[PDB]
Amino acid sequence: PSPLLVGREFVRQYYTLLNQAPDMLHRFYGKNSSYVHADAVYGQKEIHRKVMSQNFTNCHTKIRHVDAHATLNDGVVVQVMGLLSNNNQALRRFMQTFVLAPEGSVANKFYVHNDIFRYQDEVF
């Protein structure tokens, strides 16, 4: 399984679903999953709540670069650099770090174990 291709494809599903139906975003994750976007919320239920607390509506993303390498235990770690615009607003730079774990049983199936988002402007 090729990390770059996995990573490009996840990236395309995730951001696309962020624009189209953020209420479904919770399905990329598993029971152990960590979400950070300020403590980290864990698991699907709390991630759905936190996703929905952010009120994403026609949220657009401009993806400038994706790095995706093999990680321990057949996983894939992904760093994404891009710009984000919620609800017709100004685009703001961010980075997002995902860790994608093979779902174990099923072939070519993965889930999001980690998701760490941070705006540049909230740091510099």
């Binding site: 494809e9 599903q13 696309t16 479904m24 994750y29 070519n108 889930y111 999001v112």
Partner: peptide, 16 residues
């Protein structure tokens, strides 16, 4: 080889 992420309908990400 199409990759799956999470639990989804088949074809969730073959629509546009």
């Amino acid at each position: 080889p199409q990759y799956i992420f999470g639990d989804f309908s088949p074809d969730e990400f073959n629509q546009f």
